[PDB]
Amino acid sequence: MELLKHLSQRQYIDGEWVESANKNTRDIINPYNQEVIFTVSEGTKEDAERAILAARRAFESGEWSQETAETRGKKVRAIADKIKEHREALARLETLDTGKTLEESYADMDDIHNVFMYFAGLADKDGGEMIDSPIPDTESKIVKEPVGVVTQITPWNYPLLQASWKIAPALATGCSLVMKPSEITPLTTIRVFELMEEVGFPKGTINLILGAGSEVGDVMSGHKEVDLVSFTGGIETGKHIMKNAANNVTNIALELGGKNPNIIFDDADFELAVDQALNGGYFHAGQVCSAGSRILVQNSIKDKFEQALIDRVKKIKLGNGFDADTEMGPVISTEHRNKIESYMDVAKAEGATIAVGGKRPDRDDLKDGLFFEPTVITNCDTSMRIVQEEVFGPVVTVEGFETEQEAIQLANDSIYGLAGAVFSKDIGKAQRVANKLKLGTVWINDFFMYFAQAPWGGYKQSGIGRELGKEGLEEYLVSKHILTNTNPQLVNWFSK
Amino acid sequence: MELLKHLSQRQYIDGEWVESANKNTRDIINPYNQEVIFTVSEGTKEDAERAILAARRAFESGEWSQETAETRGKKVRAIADKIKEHREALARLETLDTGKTLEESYADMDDIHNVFMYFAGLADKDGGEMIDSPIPDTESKIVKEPVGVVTQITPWNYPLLQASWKIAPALATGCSLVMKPSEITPLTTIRVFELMEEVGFPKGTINLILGAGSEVGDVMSGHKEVDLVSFTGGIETGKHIMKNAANNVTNIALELGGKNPNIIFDDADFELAVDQALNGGYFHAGQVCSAGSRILVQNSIKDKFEQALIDRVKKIKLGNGFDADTEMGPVISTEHRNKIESYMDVAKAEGATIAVGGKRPDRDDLKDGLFFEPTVITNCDTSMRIVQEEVFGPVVTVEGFETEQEAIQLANDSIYGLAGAVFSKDIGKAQRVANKLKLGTVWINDFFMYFAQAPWGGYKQSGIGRELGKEGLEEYLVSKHILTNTNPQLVNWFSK
Amino acid sequence: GMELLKHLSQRQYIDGEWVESANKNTRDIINPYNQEVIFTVSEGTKEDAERAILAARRAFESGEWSQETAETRGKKVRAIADKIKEHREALARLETLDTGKTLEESYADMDDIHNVFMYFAGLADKDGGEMIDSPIPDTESKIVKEPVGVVTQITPWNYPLLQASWKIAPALATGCSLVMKPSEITPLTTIRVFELMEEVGFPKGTINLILGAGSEVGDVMSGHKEVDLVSFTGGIETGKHIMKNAANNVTNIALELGGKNPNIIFDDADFELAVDQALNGGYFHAGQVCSAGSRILVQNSIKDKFEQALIDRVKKIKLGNGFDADTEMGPVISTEHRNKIESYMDVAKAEGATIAVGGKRPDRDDLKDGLFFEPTVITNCDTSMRIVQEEVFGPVVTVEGFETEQEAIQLANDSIYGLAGAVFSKDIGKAQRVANKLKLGTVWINDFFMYFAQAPWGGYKQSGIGRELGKEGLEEYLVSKHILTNTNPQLVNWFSK
Amino acid sequence: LYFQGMELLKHLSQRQYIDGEWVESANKNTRDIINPYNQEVIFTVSEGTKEDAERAILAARRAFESGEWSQETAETRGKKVRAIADKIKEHREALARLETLDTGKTLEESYADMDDIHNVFMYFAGLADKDGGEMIDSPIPDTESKIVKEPVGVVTQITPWNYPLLQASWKIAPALATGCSLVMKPSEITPLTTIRVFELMEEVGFPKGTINLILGAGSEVGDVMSGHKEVDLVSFTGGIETGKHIMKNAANNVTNIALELGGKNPNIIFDDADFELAVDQALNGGYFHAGQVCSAGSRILVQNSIKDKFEQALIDRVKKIKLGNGFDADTEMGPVISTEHRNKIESYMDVAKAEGATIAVGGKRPDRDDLKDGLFFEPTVITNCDTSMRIVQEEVFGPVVTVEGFETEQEAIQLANDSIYGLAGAVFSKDIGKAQRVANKLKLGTVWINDFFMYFAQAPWGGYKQSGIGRELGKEGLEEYLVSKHILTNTNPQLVNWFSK
Ligand SMILES: NC(=O)c1ccc[n+]([C@@H]2O[C@H](COP(=O)([O-])OP(=O)(O)OC[C@H]3O[C@@H](n4cnc5c(N)ncnc54)[C@H](O)[C@@H]3O)[C@@H](O)[C@H]2O)c1
C-alpha cells in the first residue's frame, strides 16, 4: 500500500508524464480480495499516435540512434542497476497487481536485472560484417542499424518480465519505443518508466501508453510510422495484429501461447517427475506461457503417477501472495476465472474426468478472492478441446503413451510449439526425443528454465521470431549492404 | 523454338509430372510479337493442396531433412553445375519468355549458377551454438533446424533468378518446397525442375505448381501445413499474402517493389552518371525491382544532365531480344503496357512533363510487339503519383536538389526502401549519404550490383526479411534451445 | 614397380616448373611390405627451399592469387577436390604402396581428402571480416581479414596426403602462397597432388613443392624471414626445434604434434563394442596414428575379463600386404622406426611391465622380408613408466586399471599430451561429465577416430599449438587489420600552436 | 596537486600477492622506484625470486584445477570483471595520479588511460557469457558434434613500463572473463598502479590462487614465467629481443604465446592532406608520452611537393613544445622513464649523425634550470635520412621522428612497409578513396585514416610481421585465453568388425 503513494498515475509521452487526452481513467484490482488499489489514466488512440510520432521525431534526430553503442550499453546497464536497487518494492508491487507469490516475484526481479545486464553487454559487440566481394575493385559491407520506431505490447501474467525482454534490446540497439502493458496490470511498468526517466534518455526515445487494446492497439500495430510490432499475448490477438500490421508491411515479432508437453517416461526419477509436474502446472496458477499443462506419462507408470499427483494437488496451499505459507495465488480476474470454469464444462461434456479440483474454493479466507482450485483432468485424448486449447489456469491433463514414438506424436499433435520437457534417466533417449519435438525450448529433466543468454520463442503457432539471446537483439536491427565501386567504368550498353 | 519440343508442359507434384486436376491449360506469349509459343497446365487449388501435403509427408519422413548438410550441399552444387551445363538453352528460353536481351539472360544464368554454388557451400557451416549457461550443472545449446514446408512465389521479370534465390537455401537447409512461378512466365522454372529431378531428390521434397495467383495463391499462403511463405512480387499482393498467412501464424519473407533513388551530385563523373542513369532506368525496359526510376540530380548540373540524358534516350535501339543490336526489348504484356500508358496520363494531369517518349513506337518492325518508348519525365516533385508509385516500365523522373540534406530527404520521401545509388567523386560524402538512406542496398558509383554473398531486401515497405547471404539462409531455419539439467533436484515448492 | 609410377614426376615443383635438386642428388623410396626400392626422387638443397620461398613471396606480392576473388579461389579449391575424386583409385593405391597401410584405409583417406578440399572451397567466400560499432563518434571501424602471406607446410609419413590436404586447402582458399615439404620417405601422393593442382591452374609461384630431409632444408622453411607462418605436423621434439627457429623472425606457428590418447572403458560400456574399438584404436595402421588409443584405461571390475578378450583378439589379427583384402594390419614404415619400437619393448620389460602378447617381429615365412611387428599388449604397468607416458607410435597398447570415475580422469590427463581420446559407457551422462574434464582437443563418446573438415582438430597441452580443419583451421591462414576512418577530423591542439 | 600524489603511497602495499596473501620476497630483497621528473626515490617494493614465481604458478594451477573460478558461470565471471571496472572508475583520480607519478607522463594522458581501462574491463565483462562454442552439422549420421570453448588454463602476463595499467588491463580482463588463473609481472621499474589494481581486485573477491602478482626483474624471474611446464599461455608486451627470447623458452613445453612487440609506424602525409591537421597529428604521433608509445608515429613519410613546407611547420611547432612536470597543467611533454633509456636515445643521435642524417632540432637534454634534475630529452626531428639507415629502421622509443620524402603513392607504400615491423600507421589525405587504397596495401595491424592513436576494446590490436604474434582486445583478444574441444557423441554405436573374431 505504501508503494502506491508516490507512484505515477499517468502515461509518459515525449518526456512528460501526462493524463489521457479525455481525462478518462481505469481502476486497478488486487485479485486476492478484488479491491481497487489504484487508479490510472486510460489513454485514447490520439495519445498513442502522438507517442508514435514522438518516437519517430526522436529516432530521426539521432540523439539516441546515433549515440555510441558502448554508451547505449552503459545506460541499459544503469537500468539494470535500478531494478536491483528497487528489487524489494518492485517485487511487492508485482505481487500486489498480479497476485502471484512474493518469492515468484523476487525471482522475476532477479531475471529482469540479468536481462538488462545481458543486453547492456551485447550492445557494442556486432556492428555488421565485411564481405569478400565477387566483383573486383569493389568494397562490400553489411551494417546493422536500429530498425526504427517499435511498438511493444505485453500481457498481464508477468508484466515487467515481458517488458524487460522488449525494452532492453530496443534501447541497446538505438530504437525509439512505445510500450503499452496489459490494461489491468500497469503498476510495475509505470514504475520502470519512472526509473528509466531517472537514468536519462532523449526526449521521445521511450514512451508509455496506458489503455485497452481494443481502444489503442490498432494504432500501435497499424500506424505507418511503426517499423516493428513486438507482441506477447494470446494467439487470436496475435493474428489480428499481424493482419493489421500488413497494411504498411510492418515487421512483427509474436510470442503467443502454448500447449506445452511434459513427457514422463517410466525410467524417470519418479519423485522428481511429480515435483516438476506440479511446478509446471501450478506455478502462478498455471498462468504461464510455458506451463506444462499437457502431461504425457508412460502407460506402465500412469496409474501410479496419477495417484501421486492427485494427492499432492489436494495439499496445495492457496492464499495471499504476501503470505509465506502460500504456494499458489489467485487467478487474475473474474473474466479469466469464468473462462477457466467454462473449460471445466467443456471437458466434462466431451468425456473427460475432473479427477480433482475444477471449482472455486469455498474456504472462508478465500471466498472474497479470485481463487480456483488446482485441477487434474484424466481420461482424455488428443481429439478433445481441453487437451488442444490453452486453458491458462491451474489445470493439467494426463495422457498415456506406450512407446517413445507415440509420446513424440502426441507432444507434437497441437497447433502450438513454445516449450516442453522430457523426464528420463536415459539421457540418450531424452536427447532423441528432444530432437524430434517441434518446440522452441526443450528441457531435459527440468522445467521453466529460460534466460537472457538463449533465444525464446515458438515453432508453429506459438509465434513468429524470437526474444532473448542474440536472435532477440536482431528483431530490433535491419541490415544495409553498402557496395562501393573503387574503379567505376561506363558499361556502354546503350548507344552513344 | 527448338528448346520447346522436349520441354514439359505440366506441374510436378510428389515425384510425378502431372496435368491440372481439371485438365485446364494456359497459353504462353512471346512479348516481341505477341504469338503463342507454348501451352502449359493451369492447376487448381486442390493440386496446390496436394503438393503441400506431399511436401509435409516428405519433410516428416526425414529423407531430406535428416540428410547430412554436407550431402545436401553436394546436391545443391549438382544443380549449380546443371545451370552452367544448360546455360545457353536456359538463357534463350528466358529471353523467349520474358523478352529481355540475350546478354541480359546470359548474365542471369551466370548469377544463378553462383547463387546455387554459394548456398551449396554454406549448407554445412553453422548448425547452431553452445551457450555458457548461467545455471550451474546444466548444458545449454541452440540447434538450427529446417523450418519445414515452404511455399515460394515468383514474379515474371526475372523468373529463374528469383526462383534460384528461394530454392537454393530451402534445399541447402533440408526444407521441402512448393514453388509457383508467375502464370505468364513458367518456361525456365519448368526447365529447372526437370534439371533438379535429374539430380535426384526424395519424392515430395520439390514440387511445382503452375497457375494464376488469384486461383491457387491463397492455398499457398494460407494452408496450415505451410511453415514459411517466401514471396517476391508487388506490394498489394504482399499485403494480401501477409494477411492470409496470419490465419495460421505463418512466417513470411517478402521482397516487394521499390522507388529507388539514383542520386547524382555535381562532382560526379558526369559521363559515368549518365551511363548508369540510362542503365538504371532502362535495363529490361525498367521492369526491375532495383530500377533507378527516381533520378535526383543536383541543381547546378540539372539542366546539363537532362539534355545529355534525353539525347541518349532518343538513340536507344529497341527490338527483338535475340538480335545483338537490341538494347531494350518490349514490356511483358498488353495489360502491363496499358498500366504504363495510364501513368503517362496521370503524370501529364498532375503537371509533369513528358520530355521524351511516353508512347508506343510506331516503327514498322515494332508495331506487332509490346514495345513502349524509353521515357523521361521532367518538372515533377515528390507530391506526385508518377514520382511516388512504382511504374515498373521504361520510365524515369528527374528532380533537382540544392544540398546534400535535401537529396537525402527526397530519396527517403517514399513508402519504399529497396535499393539506390549515389554518384560523386567525393567518396566521403557518398559514404555520409549512404549511411542516411533507408535502403537495403546502396551503391556508391555503381548500379545493379547484387550477389549471393550479400543479403538483399528492403527497408520499410519494400519488404520483410532478406534473401541471399547468411541472412537469406536463416529465413529457412528455426532455432531450438535444448537445456539439460545434469544434476536435477526437486524444487519442493509444493507440500508433500 | 607398378603402373602408377611410370608417369609420376620425380622432381620438385618450384616457381611453375618441375625441376631437379640444385646438386642433382636423389633419394630412393621404399615399400615397407618387402623393403624394395620402388621409385627415385630428387633430394633438394637448402638453396632450392630458399628459392621456392622467394618465389612464393614474389607471387604473393603480385596479387594474382591473393587479390583474386574469394569466390573464384573457392571454385579452384573445388576443382582440386574434384580431381581427388576423379583419381581416387590411383591415389589410394599409391598411398598404400608408399606407406604400407591397407587399401581400404587408403580409400577412406581419399574420401576425407575430397571432403576437406570441398569444405574449404565452400568456406572461402563466407567471412571477410566485421564492422564494429565504434565508441568514438564520427568514425568508421572495420576489421578486414587478409591472407597471412607466405606459408611453409611440413608433413609426416603416416598419412601423407591427408595431412597435406589439411594445410593446402585453407592456404589456397585464403589467398596465401605456399611451400610444402612432405616426409622425405613418403612423397609419392604429395607429388601426385601437385601434378593435379598444376592441371587446375594457379599463378606461377602460388604453390611449390620441396623434396628433402628435414635436417637439410627444414631450418630454411621455419627460419627464413619471408615466411609468415609455419604449419607443422610431426613429432614433439621437431616441433620444439621449429618453434625455437621460427622465433628468430617472430614467425607465427601452427603445431600438430603427438599424443598419448586415452581410451577409457567403464564396466557399464557395451563390452563387445569396447573391445572392437580398443583393437581399432590401437592397431589401425599398425598404431602409426597421432590419435591412436595406445593408453587403455579400463575399470577394475572388468579389467581381467577385458585383458583376456583383448589378448585373444590380438592373436588373430591378420598381418600382410596392404593390397591384399585379407590384411587387417600392414607393416610399420621403416627399419629405423621398427627398431625404435623394439627398443621400447626393452624399456617396458626393464621398468617392470609385462608383454602379455606380441612384442616381436613375426617370423611367419610370407612376412619375414617385410617391416612387420606383431600387435602388442602391455600389462602390469602404471603412469610412472616411460612405456605409458611416451608416444611409441607402433602397434602397441598399455592397459591400466582405475576404480572410480575421478581416477580415470586423473590418469587420462597424467601426460604431457592432449590430442584426442575416448570414453565408453552406456551412461551417457557420465560420459559427458568425463568428456568435460578431459584436457583433450577431441573427445569421442562411444566411438573412435572420428574427425572431419567441419570441426577443428588439434591439441591441448603439448600435443600442439593452434588448430586445423573447421573455421579455426582457416584462421591460421588469416591476419586481421583494423581500418579506422575519421569522417570528421578535428585538430587535437595538444601542443602549442 | 603532486601532493595528492605522495599521499597515495602511504596506504599502498609494497609486496607481491601470491596465493591470496600479500607477501615479501623469499629473500627479503627490495627495489627502489624512481620518479623520472626529479629522479627521487618515491617508494620501495619487494624484489621477488624465481622460487616466488614458481610458487605463484603452482598456486594458479591448484586454483584452476579446483574449478572455483574456471567452473563459475560465465555470467557471474562477467559481473566480477564489471566490478573491477567500477573500481577503476571509483579510484580514477588516485590511479591517474599514481601512474603520472611513476611513469612521468602528463596527468591528462593518465586520466585518458583510466577511462580506457574502465572501458576495457567493461567490454570484456559484457563479452564473457556471449559465445560458449558451436554446434556442428555432422557429416556422419547418428552423431552429435559440438565445439566447447574452455579457458586455456594458467596464464603468465608480462607488461612494459610505458603504460603499465593499460597494458595490464588488456591481459587481465579476458583472462578473468574466461575463467583462467593468472600470474602477472609488471615492469620492475613501474609497479605502482599494478599493485593498486591487485588491491582492488582483492576487494572485489576472487578464489585463492586465481590472481597473483610477482614483482621483479625479467632477467631474474622471466624465464620461470615463460618456461615453467604448468603455464598454458604466455602473454607478453615488450621489446622484440625479449619476445624472441620468450618464444624460444616457451617452446620447451610447447606453450602458446601472444606477443605484442614494437613498431616503426609510418605516418603518411599526402600533399592533398588537411595541412594543419597533418602537422597536429604528426606532433601527436611523435611526442605523446615523449614518443614512448608502441604506436608512435616515428616514421613520417611526406610527399615531396609539400616536404619543405611541412618540415618547417613541424620544426617550428617542436620548438614551442612545453616540457615539464606531469602534474603541472602547462606541461605538454614529460620526461623519459630512466637514465638507461635516455642514454639509449642519446646514443641514437650519435648513430644518426654518423650515418649521414641531420638533427634539424632537439637531440639533446634540455639545460633549462627547472628541467636539469629530471630525465628530460628535447623533442627531436631528424631530416635527410633514408630507409637504409638504422635511425629509420630501428625503434628509438623516444621523442624522435624521422622525415622521408616520397614522389608517388606506390613509393609511399613501399617505404611504409620497408621495415621488420607492422603494428600501426596512418594516412592523411582528403582523397578518401586514395587513403583507402593505401590502407589495404599496408602490412599493419591497425591503420588510421586522417587520425592517429585510436584504439579501443571493441577492436583487435596487434601486429603483422615482427610487431607480434596474436591479438589483444576485441573478440580475438578473448580467444587467446580460450581453447577449443570437439566432443563427438555416437548416438547409435556399432562395431566396426575390422579385426577377426
Ligand atoms: N524486392 C525484390 O527483390 C523484387 C525483385 C523482382 C521483382 N520485384 C517486384 O515484383 C513485382 C513484379 O512482379 P508481378 O507483377 O508478377 O507481381 P504480382 O504481385 O503482380 O505477382 C507476383 C506473383 O504473385 C502471384 N499471386 C498473385 N496473387 C496471389 C495471391 N493472392 N496469393 C499468392 N500469390 C499470388 C502471381 O501468380 C505471381 O507469381 C514488382 O512490384 C517488382 O518491383 C521485387
Q: How far apart are CA B212 and CA B26, in angstroms?
A: 10
Number of inter-chain CB pairs under 8 A, B vs C: 43
Q: At a CB cut-off of 8 Å and minimum separation 6, what does C399 contact?
A: C296, C298, C303, C306, C307, C310, C377, C378, C379, C381
In this structure, which amino acid lies at residue A278?
A: L
Give the start-end residues of each E strand in B154-260: 176-180, 206-208, 228-232, 251-255
Residues contacting residue A344 through CB under 8 Å, at least 6 positions apart = A354, A358, A359, A375
Domain that holds residue A372: 258-451
Task: Chain C: give the shortest CA distance to residue D491, in Å.
Answer: 8
* Rg over CA atoms, chain C: 24
- Candidates A141, A453, A471: best to mutate against D (most CBs of D within 10 A) is A453
E runs forming strands in A265-350: 294-298
Rounded to whole angstroms, the Cα distance separating D220 from A358 reads: 79
Q: Measured at the alpha carbon of residue D238, what is the angle toward residues D232 and D239, in degrees to the nearest 5?
A: 120
B433 touches chain A (CB under 8 A): no
Integer angstrom CA distances of residue C239 from C231, C246, C255, C465, D48 = 10, 10, 7, 10, 33
Mutation choice for C interface testing from D279, D489, D491 by most C CBs within 10 A: D489
Q: What chains are in contact with D, requiring at least 3 Cβ pairs below 8 Å?
A: A, B, C
Give the whole-angstrom CA distance, residue C20 versus residue C209.
Answer: 11
Q: Are strands A419-423 and A261-264 parallel, antiparallel or unpaired?
A: parallel
For the CA of B235, the nearest atom of ligand 1? 41
d(CA B255, CA B468): 12
Chains touching chain B through at least 3 C-beta pairs below 8 angstroms are A, C, D
Residue pair B120/B76 in contact by the 8 Å Cβ criterion = yes
**Which of D205, D209, D160 has the alpha carbon at shortest distance from D56?**
D209
Q: How many CB atoms lie within 10 A of CB D20?
A: 16
Tell me how far apart the alpha carbons of residues A320 and C259 are, in angstroms, rounded to a whole number: 64
Contact A442, B483 (CB under 8 A): yes
C-alpha cell of residue A238:
496475435
The verdict on B62 touching D (C-beta cutoff 8 Å) is no
Q: Are C284 and C375 in contact (CB under 8 A)?
A: no
Greatest C-alpha distance within chain A: 95
Instruction: Go through A38-68 and write b for each residue having 16 or more CB atoms within 10 A of its CB, e for each that does not.
Output: bebbbbbbebbbbbbbbbbebbeeebbbebb
Are the CB atoms for C417 and C388 separated by under 8 Å? no
Q: For the stretch D343-378, what's the b/e string if a residue is b when 16 or more beta carbons lie within 10 angstroms of its beta carbon?
A: eebeebbeebeeeebebbbbbebbeeeebeebbbbb
Chain A: closest CA distance from residue D450 (Å)? 19
Please tell me the distance from the alpha carbon of residue B102 to that of residue B284, in angstroms, as a whole number. 11
Element (H, E) at C12: strand C12-14
Closest CA to A263 of A445, A462, A459, A458: A445
Find, among B193, B164, B179, B210, the residue nearest to B38 by Cα. Answer: B210
How far is it between the farthest Cα atoms of chain C? 94
End-to-end CA distance of chain D: 87
Question: Does C490 contact chain B (CB < 8 Å)?
Answer: no
Of D456, D472, D487, at which residue does a domain stop? D456
Cβ neighbours of residue A14 under 8 Å, at least 6 residues apart?
A: A50, A51, A54, A203, A204, A207
Each residue of C406-442: b (16+ CB within 10 Å) or e?
eebbebbbbbbbbbbbbbbbebbbbbbebbbbbbbbb
Cβ atoms A130, C144 nearer than 8 A: yes
**Residue A212 grid cell:** 485497452
- Find the closest chain D residue to C476 by CA distance: D470
Phi and psi dihedrals of B437, rounded to 5? -85, 125
Burial readout A463-487 (b: 16 or more C-beta within 10 A, e: otherwise): bbbbbbbbbbbbbbbbbbbbbbbbe
CB contact under 8 A, C124 and A136: no
Residue D497 with chain C: CB contacts under 8 Å: 276
Atom of ligand 1 nearest to the CA of B211: 37
- Residue that is written with C-alpha cell 639509449 in the block: D344
Task: Please state, in angstroms and as integers, the Cα–Cα distance from residue D442 to each residue in A159, B420, D427, following that order.
Answer: 54, 32, 10
> Where does residue A24 fall: left (phi above 0), alpha (psi -120 to 50 degrees), or beta otherwise?
beta
Is D145:B126 a contact under the CB 8 Å cutoff?
A: no
Q: Give residues with Cβ within 8 angstroms of B5, minimum separation 6.
A: none
Mapping DSSP to helix (H, G, I), strand (E, B) and coil, where does residue A451 land?
A: coil
Region of C17 please: left (phi>0), alpha (psi -120 to 50) or beta: beta
Q: How far apart are CA B222 and CA B247, in angstroms?
A: 7
B92-107: b (≥16 Cβ within 10 Å) or e = bbbbbbbbbbbebbbb
The DSSP output letter for A180 is E
What is the resolution of the experimental data for this entry, in Å? 2.8
- Single out the catalytic residue among A255, A373, A390, A475: A255
Alpha-carbon gap, residue A318 to A329, rounded angstroms? 6
Under a CB-based contact definition with an 8 Å cutoff, are residues C173 and C73 in contact? yes
Answer for the pair C418, C386: CB distance below 8 angstroms, yes or no.
no
Same domain, C245 and C263: no
Pairwise CA distance, residues B399 & B298, whole Å: 8
The C-alpha angle with vertex D221 and arms to D215 and D224, in degrees rounded to 5, equals: 130
- Domain match, B170 and B209 both: yes
3-state secondary structure of A16: strand
Q: Looking at the structure, tell me whether residues D437 and D465 fall in a common domain.
A: no
Q: Are residues B239 and B311 both part of a single domain?
A: no
What's at D145, amino acid-wise?
A: S
Report the Cα C376 to chain-centroid distance in Å: 24
Which CATH number do you get for residue D469? 3.40.605.10
C324 C-beta neighbours (distance < 10 Å), count: 12
Q: Could you identify the residue written with the cell 516533385?
A: B381
β-strands D211-213, C129-132: how paired? Answer: unpaired
Q: In this structure, what is the dihedral angle of CA atoms A157, A161, A166, A171, given to the nearest 10 degrees?
A: 150
Torsion sign over Cα D339, D341, D342, D347: positive
A134 and A276 in a single domain? The answer is no
Distance of alpha carbon A484 from alpha carbon A463, whole angstroms: 38
Total residues belonging to chain D:
501
3-state secondary structure of D68: coil
Whose CA is closest to B358, among B368, B367, B346, B350? Answer: B346
This structure was determined by: X-ray
Q: How far apart are CA A400 and CA A263, in angstroms?
A: 10
Distance CA B496, CA B489 (A): 15
Report the atom number in ligand 1 closest to the C-alpha of B165: 3
Estimate the crossing angle of helix D240-250 against helix C236-246, to 10 degrees.
180
Q: Which residues contact A195 (CB under 8 A, 6 or more apart)?
A: A79, A82, A83, A86
B487 vs A: CB within 8 A:
no
Whether residues C245 and C264 fall in one domain: no
**For residue C238, which of C260, C262, C222, C261 has the smallest C-alpha distance?**
C222
Backbone dihedral angles phi then psi of residue B335, each to the nearest 5 degrees: -65, -45
Count of domains for chain A: 2
Q: Strand A441-444 to strand B477-485: parallel, antiparallel, or no bridges (unpaired)?
A: parallel
C159 close to C237: Cβ distance less than 8 angstroms: no
Tell me the residue type at A453.
Q
Residues D211 and D344 in one domain: no
Q: In what order do the strands lie in the sheet with B176-180?
A: B16-18, B11-13, B206-208, B176-180, B149-153, B228-232, B251-255, B463-464
- Taking the C-alpha atoms of residue B328 and residue C420, their distance in angstroms, rounded to an integer, is 63
Q: Mutating which of B132, B431, B444 best tests the D interface, going by the most D Cβ atoms within 10 A?
A: B132
Contact (Cβ atoms closer than 8 angstroms) between residue A126 and residue D474? no
Asked if residue B235 lies in contact with residue B460, where contact means CB atoms within 8 angstroms, the answer is: no
Provide the 3-class DSSP secondary structure of residue D93.
Answer: helix
Domain-ending residue, one of A451, A468, A483: A451
For residue D468, the surrounding DSSP H or E stretch is strand D468-469
Interatomic CA distance for residues D139 and C112, integer angstroms: 11
D242 closest CA partner among D228, D262, D256: D262
* A204 and A246, same domain (yes or no): yes
User: What is the C-alpha separation between B118 and C125, in angstroms, rounded?
Assistant: 8
Contacts of residue A303, defined as CB under 8 A and 6 or more positions apart, other chains included, come to none
Same domain, D290 and D408: yes
Q: B214 and chain A: CB distance < 8 Å anywhere? A: no
d(CA A494, CA B326): 9
Apex A218 CA angle, A217 and A220, nearest 5: 65
What is the DSSP-derived secondary structure letter of residue B242? H
Helices (H), D27-106: 50-66, 74-90, 92-103
Partners of residue A485 on adjacent β-strands? A138
- How far apart CA C386 and CA A318 sit, in angstroms, is 68
Pocket test for ligand 1, best of B40, B214, B237, B343 (most atoms within 8 A of CB): B237
Phi/psi of residue C418, nearest 5 degrees: -175, 50
Phi, psi of B176 (to 5 degrees): -110, 145
Residue of C179, C180, C164, C210 lying closest to C27 (CA atoms):
C210
How many CB atoms neighbour CB B62 within 10 A? 12
**Residue A16 bridge partners (DSSP):** A13
In the structure, which protein residues have their CB atom closer than 6 angstroms to any atom of ligand 1? B 153-157, 162, 180-183, 212-214, 217-218, 220-221, 232-234, 237, 240-241, 255-258, 289, 390, 392, 418, 462-463
Q: Which residues contact C117 (CB under 8 A, 6 or more apart)?
A: C77, C78, C80, C81, C84, C165, C169
CB A93 within 8 A of CB A3: yes
Asked if B37 and B87 touch (Cβ cutoff 8 Å), the reply is no
Interface contact flag, D135 B124, Cβ < 8 Å:
no
Instruction: Say yes or no: A315 and A420 in one domain.
Output: yes
- Side chain identity at C41, as an amino acid letter? V
Q: Does residue D248 contact residue D240 with C-beta atoms inside 8 Å?
A: no
Distance CA D457, CA D170 (A): 8
Q: How many Å apart are CA D307 and CA D314, to the nearest integer?
A: 10
CB C268 within 8 A of CB A428: no
SS3 B322: coil
C290 is catalytic: yes
Same domain, yes or no: B244 and B106? yes
Distance from C-alpha of A254 to C-alpha of A245, rounded to nearest angstrom: 12
Rounded distance, CA B430 to CA B434, Å?
6
Residues of C in contact with D462 (CB under 8 A): 480
Q: Give A16's contacts (C-beta < 8 A, 6+ positions apart).
A: none
Chain B residue closest to D71 (CA)? B136
- Strand C396-402 and strand C295-299: the pairing is parallel
Work out which ligand 1 atom sits closest to the CA atom of B336: 15
Question: A466 and chain B: CB distance < 8 Å anywhere?
Answer: yes
Please provide the DSSP assignment of B437-453 as one string: ---SEEEES--S---TT
Q: Indicate the residue of B430, B440, B483 with minimum beta-carbon distance to A480.
A: B440
- The end-to-end CA distance of chain C, in Å, is 83
- Tell me the torsion sign for CA atoms C214, C215, C216, C218: positive
β-pair partners for C484: C141, D448
DSSP letter at A389 equals S
Q: Map grid coordinates 529507388 to a residue.
A: B260
Q: Which 69-108 residues of chain D touch chain B by CB within 8 A?
A: 71, 73-76
Nearest Cα residue in chain A from C69:
A134
How far apart (Å, rounded) are the C-alpha atoms in residues B347 and A362? 75
Enumerate residues 6+ apart whose C-beta is below 8 A from A420.
A260, A261, A262, A263, A292, A411, A437, A439, A441, A442, A443
3-state DSSP assignment of residue B294:
strand
What sign does the CA torsion over D1, D4, D6, D12 have?
Answer: negative
Distance CA C27, CA C42 (A): 6
What is the DSSP pairing of strand D16-18 with strand C207-209?
A: unpaired
Among partner residues C71, C122, C471, which is closest to B120 by beta-carbon distance?
A: C122
D71 φ, ψ (degrees, to nearest 5): -105, 5
Among candidate residues D182, D178, D180, the one with its CA nearest the CA of residue D158? D182
- D180 catalytic? Reply is no
Nearest CA to ligand 1 atom 2: B255
Q: C-alpha grid cell for residue C278?
A: 580398443
The three grid cell numbers given for residue B117, joined into one nine-digit string: 554454388
Report the CATH number that the domain containing residue B289 is assigned in CATH: 3.40.309.10
Residues C137 and C269 in one domain: no
